[PDB]
Amino acid sequence: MRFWPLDATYSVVGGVPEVRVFGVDGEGRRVVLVDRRFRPYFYAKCDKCDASLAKSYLSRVAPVEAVEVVERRFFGRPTIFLKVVAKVPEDVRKLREAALGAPGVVDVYEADIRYYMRYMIDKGVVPCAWNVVEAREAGKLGPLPLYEVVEWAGVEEGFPPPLRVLAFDIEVYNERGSPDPLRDPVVMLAVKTSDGREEVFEAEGRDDRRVIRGFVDFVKEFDPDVIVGYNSNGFDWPYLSERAKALGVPLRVDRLGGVPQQSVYGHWSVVGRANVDLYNIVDEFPEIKVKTLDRVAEYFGVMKRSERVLIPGHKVYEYWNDPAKRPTLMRYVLDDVRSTLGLAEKLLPFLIQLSSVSGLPLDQVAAASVGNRVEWMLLRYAYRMGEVAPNREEREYEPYKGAIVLEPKPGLYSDVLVLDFSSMYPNIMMKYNLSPDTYLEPHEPDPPEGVVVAPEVGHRFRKAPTGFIPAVLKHLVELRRAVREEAKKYPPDSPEYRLLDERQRALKVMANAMYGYLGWVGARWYKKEVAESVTAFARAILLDVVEYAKRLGIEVIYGDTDSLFVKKSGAVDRLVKYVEERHGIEIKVDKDYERVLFTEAKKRYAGLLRDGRIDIVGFDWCELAKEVQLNVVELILKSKSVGEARERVVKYVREVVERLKAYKFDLDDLIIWKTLDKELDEYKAYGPHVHAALELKRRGYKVGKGTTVGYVIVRGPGKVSERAMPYIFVDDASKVDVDYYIEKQVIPAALRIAEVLGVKE
Ligand SMILES: [Mg+2]
Ligand SMILES: [Mg+2]
Ligand SMILES: [Mg+2]
């Protein structure tokens, strides 16, 4: 049979661990494959190898299935290990620490690999890809047909089957700032489906049993394969989980009548289906700068923010207790879920391919960090190459380290092309065979095959037998090259072409992510001399391409390790064709900006695309200050010449102050948020953040953790910052300290783009 895995789990059925894999067989029905014979294990690097002595020693701390002697590679060198095999995954920590002792071994490896990932790696199970399985049909498991796996074969090239996708959105009462699931009810919950269905379950005035019951019944009725939400792992699932407990209605949404569990990376597992949180993947997009559902929806063109209902999120209770405002609160919820499913149609095909690459399941591929995603790929490659994985220190991850090469001049630039140099790093590492296992140390016999010296960092690498990291990149390049030519078979506007284009890009992203991973100090295959050698090779040929660009009529405004910005001309085509012929690197125009504004001498800029979209790169205001930080950027980017830019900006910054002193503001725009992450009076701040969180003790009841305050400065005699009234206590007055909001933010927000203008009235 052909299987296509969606989700993987495991249980411990009476002292024997059992792996389950849920998927979609070749005949298009949802089944579950099971394996009871696999068992967890880890390696122990022995100086003297005695498995029987080892086994009996380890048997005192936990039960041991076996202790085998294996020969595997370690940084290329073939060494001997003890393969300690536990009976159940839970005992692996006890055996890991105990092993260390009784010097047979010196170190332990691969003891922290989660069990169901261990199984798929060792058996070659690739998620979101058709696998070949010999499997006996052995009755049902719940409603699902169960199959005992005999042996896994490989994977077959083949397109994804149709999946039942369910988008869902919620809104919670929240009359008091950040809601609490113990009493605050789930007011509305919409669902939208790939079939075309939409429904909204609304509560009865402060009672939300009907809606949780309706949500659960709908999920069971529709039986979705993927559940998509926006920040569903962050808020929705944790709230519904704890709300369903308080009301005593079970949140049984998974395929075995079970409730969601919070799991790795903070993602929420729904057994037998893929719970995808789109906010996990959009956080990685550096262009968006704000990343709310409505604004991300506009960037990807699924819903125009100006053609859409928008409620100030902090006031869903107000629209709920008002029958005039309830029908518009509904359309707000519908526009949310329609955008959520809209985003999914654009992003989910990519995530499915990024899951079959790298090898993480669909519910985890986006939740994991880029380096975490790459490391699970290298573990899969390390297995089929017979290589034992090194050990880790911690996870912090650091996205990609943009080392500046050509510092820009802060100012305005028109007609700018951004050239992508990300494919440079695999080329460098393959062509020069850079890898932890190929680096040379105070032993310097140059092997007969030869050596390559990194430009004046002076590190030496073997040309020899290809290293581990180059071998992986070589395979990724080959896979993509094969997929990319198969796309020529189909016409560019076909479903079959777009699917292949997503798979092609997914391979590219994982290949180009290597460079960021190998610099991450908390990486398994981290070696400082590799990263430094990759940069030095990278810096050397960038200076070549900037010098050759000058031989053409091409101005270079900015250039760092991963990209350089150039002025749009006909000559660019020769610069790109030069880098291919000279360096063997494929360069592509990443962005075509009509105008660009560099505020500082770093990669801090805003850019105006030809279609009109602005995107902003690089880094406690009110929402009016945010509005005027935009507009100002949009006014500068749409003005020709710098002189026009001031007169446009200063007129706008004055007109806002004019209406602000004329008392025509909406109060919502004046609220200043702060989220209160820890204890009150622990870091004794003294600011308006704490003082506003003090006036809530007359009548008010809250101080606790996880609660956003929202304050407005009001006129009156007092200390600096100590006039912060909460926004519910301005009793229809609209007498606000305007001198505060003009002087220390509305002007400074515009002055954060003051590359030409000072404080003016
Ligand atoms: Mg939501
Ligand atoms: Mg899962
Ligand atoms: Mg809310």
mmCIF file of C-alpha atoms in Angstrom, residues 21-361:
data_model
loop_
_atom_site.group_PDB
_atom_site.id
_atom_site.type_symbol
_atom_site.label_atom_id
_atom_site.label_comp_id
_atom_site.label_asym_id
_atom_site.label_seq_id
_atom_site.Cartn_x
_atom_site.Cartn_y
_atom_site.Cartn_z
ATOM 1 C CA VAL A 21 1.218 6.623 12.170
ATOM 2 C CA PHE A 22 -1.987 8.173 10.802
ATOM 3 C CA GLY A 23 -2.356 8.817 7.093
ATOM 4 C CA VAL A 24 -4.265 8.469 3.829
ATOM 5 C CA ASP A 25 -3.929 5.177 1.954
ATOM 6 C CA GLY A 26 -3.824 4.805 -1.825
ATOM 7 C CA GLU A 27 -7.600 4.388 -2.016
ATOM 8 C CA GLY A 28 -8.232 7.707 -0.268
ATOM 9 C CA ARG A 29 -9.382 6.627 3.201
ATOM 10 C CA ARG A 30 -7.896 7.541 6.564
ATOM 11 C CA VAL A 31 -6.071 4.640 8.244
ATOM 12 C CA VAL A 32 -3.518 4.083 11.006
ATOM 13 C CA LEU A 33 -0.338 1.995 10.766
ATOM 14 C CA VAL A 34 1.145 0.428 13.890
ATOM 15 C CA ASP A 35 4.501 -1.073 14.880
ATOM 16 C CA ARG A 36 5.131 -2.812 18.205
ATOM 17 C CA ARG A 37 8.593 -4.236 17.451
ATOM 18 C CA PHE A 38 10.645 -1.014 17.435
ATOM 19 C CA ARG A 39 12.317 0.020 20.699
ATOM 20 C CA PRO A 40 14.253 3.114 21.826
ATOM 21 C CA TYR A 41 18.029 3.144 22.112
ATOM 22 C CA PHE A 42 21.118 5.307 22.448
ATOM 23 C CA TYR A 43 24.836 4.894 21.798
ATOM 24 C CA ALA A 44 27.729 4.774 24.262
ATOM 25 C CA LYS A 45 31.279 5.339 23.005
ATOM 26 C CA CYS A 46 33.451 2.636 24.581
ATOM 27 C CA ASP A 47 37.182 2.523 25.159
ATOM 28 C CA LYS A 48 36.810 -1.164 26.077
ATOM 29 C CA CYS A 49 33.703 -2.894 24.713
ATOM 30 C CA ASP A 50 31.952 -5.366 27.041
ATOM 31 C CA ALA A 51 28.214 -5.512 26.338
ATOM 32 C CA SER A 52 27.425 -8.203 28.925
ATOM 33 C CA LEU A 53 29.248 -6.290 31.662
ATOM 34 C CA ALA A 54 27.501 -3.110 30.490
ATOM 35 C CA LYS A 55 24.013 -4.656 30.337
ATOM 36 C CA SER A 56 24.099 -6.062 33.875
ATOM 37 C CA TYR A 57 25.430 -2.746 35.196
ATOM 38 C CA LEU A 58 22.631 -0.809 33.490
ATOM 39 C CA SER A 59 19.993 -3.365 34.551
ATOM 40 C CA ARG A 60 20.132 -2.104 38.157
ATOM 41 C CA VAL A 61 18.708 1.336 37.287
ATOM 42 C CA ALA A 62 16.096 0.353 34.686
ATOM 43 C CA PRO A 63 15.090 -2.624 32.513
ATOM 44 C CA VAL A 64 17.249 -3.113 29.418
ATOM 45 C CA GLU A 65 16.183 -4.953 26.267
ATOM 46 C CA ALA A 66 19.721 -5.544 24.962
ATOM 47 C CA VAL A 67 23.207 -4.056 24.691
ATOM 48 C CA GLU A 68 24.697 -4.512 21.220
ATOM 49 C CA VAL A 69 28.131 -3.668 19.827
ATOM 50 C CA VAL A 70 27.952 -1.538 16.676
ATOM 51 C CA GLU A 71 30.430 0.168 14.358
ATOM 52 C CA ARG A 72 29.427 3.628 13.145
ATOM 53 C CA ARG A 73 31.061 6.856 12.020
ATOM 54 C CA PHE A 74 31.798 9.817 14.291
ATOM 55 C CA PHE A 75 32.929 12.949 12.436
ATOM 56 C CA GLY A 76 33.833 10.582 9.604
ATOM 57 C CA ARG A 77 36.107 8.371 11.703
ATOM 58 C CA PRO A 78 34.656 4.848 12.142
ATOM 59 C CA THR A 79 34.451 4.067 15.862
ATOM 60 C CA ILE A 80 32.863 1.386 18.047
ATOM 61 C CA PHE A 81 29.796 2.039 20.211
ATOM 62 C CA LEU A 82 27.578 0.202 22.648
ATOM 63 C CA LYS A 83 23.966 0.409 21.444
ATOM 64 C CA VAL A 84 21.997 0.374 24.697
ATOM 65 C CA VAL A 85 18.371 -0.555 23.988
ATOM 66 C CA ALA A 86 15.792 0.430 26.602
ATOM 67 C CA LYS A 87 12.433 -1.277 27.007
ATOM 68 C CA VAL A 88 10.385 1.953 27.050
ATOM 69 C CA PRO A 89 11.320 5.556 26.107
ATOM 70 C CA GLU A 90 10.723 6.905 29.627
ATOM 71 C CA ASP A 91 13.723 5.006 31.050
ATOM 72 C CA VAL A 92 16.219 6.482 28.555
ATOM 73 C CA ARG A 93 17.244 9.349 30.866
ATOM 74 C CA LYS A 94 17.914 7.022 33.811
ATOM 75 C CA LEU A 95 20.011 4.788 31.556
ATOM 76 C CA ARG A 96 21.791 7.741 29.915
ATOM 77 C CA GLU A 97 23.059 9.163 33.212
ATOM 78 C CA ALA A 98 23.817 5.744 34.714
ATOM 79 C CA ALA A 99 25.671 4.641 31.562
ATOM 80 C CA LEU A 100 28.213 7.338 31.855
ATOM 81 C CA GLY A 101 29.598 5.460 34.802
ATOM 82 C CA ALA A 102 31.857 2.407 34.935
ATOM 83 C CA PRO A 103 34.468 3.444 32.444
ATOM 84 C CA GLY A 104 33.846 1.254 29.524
ATOM 85 C CA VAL A 105 32.420 4.286 27.785
ATOM 86 C CA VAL A 106 33.512 7.875 27.819
ATOM 87 C CA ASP A 107 30.461 9.596 26.273
ATOM 88 C CA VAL A 108 26.845 8.953 25.281
ATOM 89 C CA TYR A 109 25.139 10.022 22.067
ATOM 90 C CA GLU A 110 21.640 10.331 20.573
ATOM 91 C CA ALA A 111 19.931 9.756 23.931
ATOM 92 C CA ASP A 112 17.616 12.790 23.603
ATOM 93 C CA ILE A 113 15.865 11.938 20.314
ATOM 94 C CA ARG A 114 12.100 11.808 20.813
ATOM 95 C CA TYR A 115 10.782 8.321 20.223
ATOM 96 C CA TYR A 116 8.380 8.728 17.295
ATOM 97 C CA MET A 117 10.960 10.817 15.419
ATOM 98 C CA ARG A 118 13.516 8.071 16.100
ATOM 99 C CA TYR A 119 11.156 5.563 14.467
ATOM 100 C CA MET A 120 10.501 7.582 11.307
ATOM 101 C CA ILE A 121 14.208 8.362 10.881
ATOM 102 C CA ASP A 122 15.319 4.743 11.306
ATOM 103 C CA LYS A 123 12.517 3.259 9.182
ATOM 104 C CA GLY A 124 12.652 6.018 6.559
ATOM 105 C CA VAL A 125 9.090 7.221 7.150
ATOM 106 C CA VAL A 126 8.778 10.636 5.491
ATOM 107 C CA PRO A 127 5.723 12.718 6.488
ATOM 108 C CA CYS A 128 3.577 14.335 3.799
ATOM 109 C CA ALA A 129 4.932 11.956 1.161
ATOM 110 C CA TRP A 130 3.660 8.679 -0.268
ATOM 111 C CA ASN A 131 5.472 5.809 1.454
ATOM 112 C CA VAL A 132 5.467 2.152 0.399
ATOM 113 C CA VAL A 133 4.504 -0.324 3.123
ATOM 114 C CA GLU A 134 3.869 -4.031 3.439
ATOM 115 C CA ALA A 135 1.279 -4.068 6.210
ATOM 116 C CA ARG A 136 -1.177 -6.683 7.440
ATOM 117 C CA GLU A 137 -4.735 -5.488 7.935
ATOM 118 C CA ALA A 138 -5.568 -6.272 11.585
ATOM 119 C CA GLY A 139 -9.016 -4.906 12.386
ATOM 120 C CA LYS A 140 -10.037 -1.403 13.381
ATOM 121 C CA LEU A 141 -8.645 0.960 16.019
ATOM 122 C CA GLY A 142 -11.614 3.025 17.110
ATOM 123 C CA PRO A 143 -13.254 4.158 13.870
ATOM 124 C CA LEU A 144 -9.994 3.906 11.853
ATOM 125 C CA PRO A 145 -8.771 0.775 10.057
ATOM 126 C CA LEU A 146 -5.645 -0.492 11.807
ATOM 127 C CA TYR A 147 -2.665 -2.058 10.033
ATOM 128 C CA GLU A 148 0.330 -3.921 11.441
ATOM 129 C CA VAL A 149 3.403 -2.791 9.519
ATOM 130 C CA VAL A 150 5.672 -5.574 8.298
ATOM 131 C CA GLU A 151 8.374 -3.523 6.574
ATOM 132 C CA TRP A 152 8.747 0.025 5.274
ATOM 133 C CA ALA A 153 10.080 0.444 1.753
ATOM 134 C CA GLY A 154 10.984 3.815 0.241
ATOM 135 C CA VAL A 155 8.883 6.737 -0.958
ATOM 136 C CA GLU A 156 7.246 7.199 -4.360
ATOM 137 C CA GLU A 157 7.086 10.483 -6.222
ATOM 138 C CA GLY A 158 3.461 11.566 -6.148
ATOM 139 C CA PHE A 159 1.208 14.522 -5.518
ATOM 140 C CA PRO A 160 -0.557 15.089 -2.198
ATOM 141 C CA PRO A 161 -4.072 13.675 -1.893
ATOM 142 C CA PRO A 162 -7.062 15.946 -1.273
ATOM 143 C CA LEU A 163 -7.137 16.969 2.387
ATOM 144 C CA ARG A 164 -10.120 18.121 4.438
ATOM 145 C CA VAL A 165 -9.008 21.476 5.872
ATOM 146 C CA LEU A 166 -10.794 23.300 8.696
ATOM 147 C CA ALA A 167 -10.093 26.909 9.652
ATOM 148 C CA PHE A 168 -11.374 28.191 12.981
ATOM 149 C CA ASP A 169 -11.351 31.478 14.882
ATOM 150 C CA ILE A 170 -12.575 32.461 18.346
ATOM 151 C CA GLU A 171 -13.362 35.615 20.281
ATOM 152 C CA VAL A 172 -13.439 35.726 24.082
ATOM 153 C CA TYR A 173 -15.410 38.158 26.294
ATOM 154 C CA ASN A 174 -12.384 39.853 27.953
ATOM 155 C CA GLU A 175 -14.336 42.673 29.680
ATOM 156 C CA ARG A 176 -11.416 42.789 32.128
ATOM 157 C CA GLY A 177 -8.299 43.071 29.917
ATOM 158 C CA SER A 178 -6.728 39.652 29.443
ATOM 159 C CA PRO A 179 -9.479 37.029 29.873
ATOM 160 C CA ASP A 180 -9.512 34.125 32.307
ATOM 161 C CA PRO A 181 -11.022 30.773 31.234
ATOM 162 C CA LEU A 182 -12.495 30.085 34.691
ATOM 163 C CA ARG A 183 -15.389 32.553 34.203
ATOM 164 C CA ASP A 184 -14.964 34.548 30.970
ATOM 165 C CA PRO A 185 -16.897 32.677 28.247
ATOM 166 C CA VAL A 186 -16.060 31.916 24.631
ATOM 167 C CA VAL A 187 -18.422 34.405 22.989
ATOM 168 C CA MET A 188 -18.122 33.389 19.320
ATOM 169 C CA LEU A 189 -16.401 30.627 17.364
ATOM 170 C CA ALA A 190 -16.469 30.463 13.565
ATOM 171 C CA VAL A 191 -15.364 27.571 11.365
ATOM 172 C CA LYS A 192 -14.686 27.475 7.625
ATOM 173 C CA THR A 193 -13.944 24.394 5.559
ATOM 174 C CA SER A 194 -12.323 23.407 2.286
ATOM 175 C CA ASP A 195 -15.684 21.980 1.186
ATOM 176 C CA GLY A 196 -17.190 25.463 1.365
ATOM 177 C CA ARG A 197 -19.047 25.341 4.672
ATOM 178 C CA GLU A 198 -19.096 28.146 7.219
ATOM 179 C CA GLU A 199 -20.791 28.275 10.620
ATOM 180 C CA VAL A 200 -20.595 30.483 13.708
ATOM 181 C CA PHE A 201 -21.512 29.147 17.148
ATOM 182 C CA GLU A 202 -22.560 31.977 19.466
ATOM 183 C CA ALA A 203 -23.145 31.674 23.189
ATOM 184 C CA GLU A 204 -26.203 32.514 25.238
ATOM 185 C CA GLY A 205 -25.471 35.703 27.202
ATOM 186 C CA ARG A 206 -22.422 34.606 29.283
ATOM 187 C CA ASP A 207 -23.008 30.829 28.882
ATOM 188 C CA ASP A 208 -20.829 29.039 26.336
ATOM 189 C CA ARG A 209 -21.806 25.371 26.549
ATOM 190 C CA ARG A 210 -23.593 25.436 23.178
ATOM 191 C CA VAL A 211 -20.505 26.721 21.335
ATOM 192 C CA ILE A 212 -17.884 24.289 22.665
ATOM 193 C CA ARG A 213 -20.374 21.476 22.076
ATOM 194 C CA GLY A 214 -20.998 22.807 18.568
ATOM 195 C CA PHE A 215 -17.292 23.111 17.761
ATOM 196 C CA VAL A 216 -16.522 19.562 18.932
ATOM 197 C CA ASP A 217 -19.502 18.100 17.064
ATOM 198 C CA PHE A 218 -18.546 19.937 13.864
ATOM 199 C CA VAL A 219 -14.939 18.691 13.942
ATOM 200 C CA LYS A 220 -16.189 15.133 14.450
ATOM 201 C CA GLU A 221 -18.853 15.664 11.774
ATOM 202 C CA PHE A 222 -16.489 17.098 9.138
ATOM 203 C CA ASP A 223 -13.446 14.985 10.180
ATOM 204 C CA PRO A 224 -10.695 17.387 9.052
ATOM 205 C CA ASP A 225 -7.177 16.256 8.238
ATOM 206 C CA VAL A 226 -5.646 19.696 8.898
ATOM 207 C CA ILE A 227 -6.846 22.252 11.453
ATOM 208 C CA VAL A 228 -5.559 25.764 10.726
ATOM 209 C CA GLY A 229 -5.766 28.831 12.942
ATOM 210 C CA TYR A 230 -3.971 32.107 13.544
ATOM 211 C CA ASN A 231 -2.109 32.052 16.874
ATOM 212 C CA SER A 232 -4.113 28.911 17.669
ATOM 213 C CA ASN A 233 -1.195 27.440 19.622
ATOM 214 C CA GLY A 234 -0.622 30.748 21.414
ATOM 215 C CA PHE A 235 -4.144 31.573 22.606
ATOM 216 C CA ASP A 236 -7.051 29.592 21.126
ATOM 217 C CA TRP A 237 -6.099 26.027 22.072
ATOM 218 C CA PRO A 238 -4.785 26.898 25.582
ATOM 219 C CA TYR A 239 -7.996 28.839 26.246
ATOM 220 C CA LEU A 240 -10.456 26.251 24.906
ATOM 221 C CA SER A 241 -8.533 23.506 26.726
ATOM 222 C CA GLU A 242 -8.839 25.243 30.100
ATOM 223 C CA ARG A 243 -12.327 26.599 29.346
ATOM 224 C CA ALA A 244 -13.652 23.139 28.440
ATOM 225 C CA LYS A 245 -12.458 21.874 31.825
ATOM 226 C CA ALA A 246 -14.190 24.655 33.775
ATOM 227 C CA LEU A 247 -17.510 23.986 32.013
ATOM 228 C CA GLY A 248 -17.173 20.193 32.222
ATOM 229 C CA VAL A 249 -17.726 19.619 28.499
ATOM 230 C CA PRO A 250 -14.864 17.542 27.038
ATOM 231 C CA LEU A 251 -12.886 18.947 24.108
ATOM 232 C CA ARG A 252 -12.735 15.630 22.248
ATOM 233 C CA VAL A 253 -11.658 16.715 18.766
ATOM 234 C CA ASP A 254 -8.957 14.228 17.718
ATOM 235 C CA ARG A 255 -9.598 11.052 15.719
ATOM 236 C CA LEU A 256 -9.565 8.752 18.785
ATOM 237 C CA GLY A 257 -12.097 10.767 20.781
ATOM 238 C CA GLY A 258 -9.311 12.512 22.688
ATOM 239 C CA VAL A 259 -8.562 16.089 23.716
ATOM 240 C CA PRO A 260 -5.684 18.290 22.479
ATOM 241 C CA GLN A 261 -2.380 18.103 24.343
ATOM 242 C CA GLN A 262 0.306 20.781 24.511
ATOM 243 C CA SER A 263 3.532 19.334 23.136
ATOM 244 C CA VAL A 264 6.967 20.212 21.764
ATOM 245 C CA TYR A 265 7.772 23.800 20.688
ATOM 246 C CA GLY A 266 4.574 24.792 22.478
ATOM 247 C CA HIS A 267 2.570 23.327 19.603
ATOM 248 C CA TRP A 268 -0.737 21.621 20.371
ATOM 249 C CA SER A 269 -1.170 18.009 19.267
ATOM 250 C CA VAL A 270 -4.505 16.784 17.914
ATOM 251 C CA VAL A 271 -3.917 13.058 17.437
ATOM 252 C CA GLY A 272 -4.574 11.796 13.919
ATOM 253 C CA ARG A 273 -4.558 15.221 12.253
ATOM 254 C CA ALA A 274 -2.275 18.190 11.594
ATOM 255 C CA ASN A 275 -2.830 21.209 13.850
ATOM 256 C CA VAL A 276 -1.122 24.067 11.982
ATOM 257 C CA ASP A 277 -0.742 27.550 13.479
ATOM 258 C CA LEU A 278 -0.104 30.050 10.689
ATOM 259 C CA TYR A 279 1.386 32.564 13.133
ATOM 260 C CA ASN A 280 4.275 30.113 13.582
ATOM 261 C CA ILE A 281 5.368 30.544 9.960
ATOM 262 C CA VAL A 282 4.543 34.243 9.434
ATOM 263 C CA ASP A 283 6.745 35.166 12.409
ATOM 264 C CA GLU A 284 9.700 34.164 10.205
ATOM 265 C CA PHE A 285 8.783 36.742 7.519
ATOM 266 C CA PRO A 286 10.977 39.810 8.183
ATOM 267 C CA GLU A 287 8.979 42.103 5.859
ATOM 268 C CA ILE A 288 5.691 42.373 7.745
ATOM 269 C CA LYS A 289 6.847 44.170 10.940
ATOM 270 C CA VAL A 290 3.451 43.886 12.675
ATOM 271 C CA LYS A 291 2.055 40.424 11.841
ATOM 272 C CA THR A 292 -1.596 40.729 12.830
ATOM 273 C CA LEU A 293 -4.038 38.518 10.925
ATOM 274 C CA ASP A 294 -5.658 41.460 9.124
ATOM 275 C CA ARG A 295 -2.347 42.992 8.029
ATOM 276 C CA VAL A 296 -0.754 39.683 7.004
ATOM 277 C CA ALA A 297 -3.933 38.859 5.072
ATOM 278 C CA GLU A 298 -3.496 42.084 3.089
ATOM 279 C CA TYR A 299 0.199 41.480 2.343
ATOM 280 C CA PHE A 300 -0.572 38.100 0.757
ATOM 281 C CA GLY A 301 -3.646 39.524 -0.983
ATOM 282 C CA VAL A 302 -6.429 37.393 0.487
ATOM 283 C CA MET A 303 -8.441 40.259 1.992
ATOM 284 C CA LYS A 304 -8.107 44.027 1.725
ATOM 285 C CA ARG A 305 -8.001 45.687 5.144
ATOM 286 C CA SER A 306 -10.047 48.641 3.857
ATOM 287 C CA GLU A 307 -12.745 46.316 2.441
ATOM 288 C CA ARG A 308 -13.098 44.566 5.807
ATOM 289 C CA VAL A 309 -14.772 45.086 9.169
ATOM 290 C CA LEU A 310 -12.326 45.942 11.964
ATOM 291 C CA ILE A 311 -13.204 45.977 15.672
ATOM 292 C CA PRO A 312 -10.689 47.174 18.290
ATOM 293 C CA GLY A 313 -9.919 43.755 19.736
ATOM 294 C CA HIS A 314 -9.910 44.992 23.333
ATOM 295 C CA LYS A 315 -13.671 45.727 23.009
ATOM 296 C CA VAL A 316 -15.364 42.502 21.958
ATOM 297 C CA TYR A 317 -17.363 42.557 25.210
ATOM 298 C CA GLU A 318 -18.755 45.972 24.253
ATOM 299 C CA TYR A 319 -19.910 44.757 20.832
ATOM 300 C CA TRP A 320 -21.335 41.643 22.552
ATOM 301 C CA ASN A 321 -23.496 43.394 25.177
ATOM 302 C CA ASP A 322 -25.010 45.635 22.466
ATOM 303 C CA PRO A 323 -27.506 44.049 20.031
ATOM 304 C CA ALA A 324 -26.736 46.864 17.579
ATOM 305 C CA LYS A 325 -23.035 45.918 17.514
ATOM 306 C CA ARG A 326 -23.362 42.114 17.647
ATOM 307 C CA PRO A 327 -24.031 41.541 13.895
ATOM 308 C CA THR A 328 -20.859 43.483 13.044
ATOM 309 C CA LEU A 329 -18.847 41.569 15.647
ATOM 310 C CA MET A 330 -19.942 38.453 13.755
ATOM 311 C CA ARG A 331 -18.672 39.726 10.399
ATOM 312 C CA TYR A 332 -15.413 40.619 12.138
ATOM 313 C CA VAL A 333 -15.211 36.958 13.173
ATOM 314 C CA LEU A 334 -16.156 35.801 9.658
ATOM 315 C CA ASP A 335 -13.519 38.034 8.062
ATOM 316 C CA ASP A 336 -11.007 36.483 10.472
ATOM 317 C CA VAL A 337 -11.803 32.871 9.557
ATOM 318 C CA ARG A 338 -12.141 33.697 5.847
ATOM 319 C CA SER A 339 -8.683 35.285 5.959
ATOM 320 C CA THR A 340 -7.339 32.314 7.942
ATOM 321 C CA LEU A 341 -8.481 29.809 5.319
ATOM 322 C CA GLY A 342 -7.329 32.241 2.633
ATOM 323 C CA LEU A 343 -3.820 32.368 4.089
ATOM 324 C CA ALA A 344 -3.840 28.567 4.404
ATOM 325 C CA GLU A 345 -4.544 28.162 0.680
ATOM 326 C CA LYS A 346 -1.368 30.178 0.013
ATOM 327 C CA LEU A 347 0.933 28.901 2.787
ATOM 328 C CA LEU A 348 -0.180 25.315 3.468
ATOM 329 C CA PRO A 349 1.043 23.825 0.129
ATOM 330 C CA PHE A 350 4.532 25.104 0.977
ATOM 331 C CA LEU A 351 4.437 23.731 4.531
ATOM 332 C CA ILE A 352 3.465 20.272 3.248
ATOM 333 C CA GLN A 353 6.561 20.206 1.035
ATOM 334 C CA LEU A 354 8.707 21.683 3.809
ATOM 335 C CA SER A 355 7.435 18.754 5.909
ATOM 336 C CA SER A 356 8.484 16.073 3.406
ATOM 337 C CA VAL A 357 11.811 17.836 3.233
ATOM 338 C CA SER A 358 13.510 18.151 6.638
ATOM 339 C CA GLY A 359 11.149 15.418 7.836
ATOM 340 C CA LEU A 360 9.101 16.959 10.644
ATOM 341 C CA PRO A 361 5.341 16.303 10.811
#
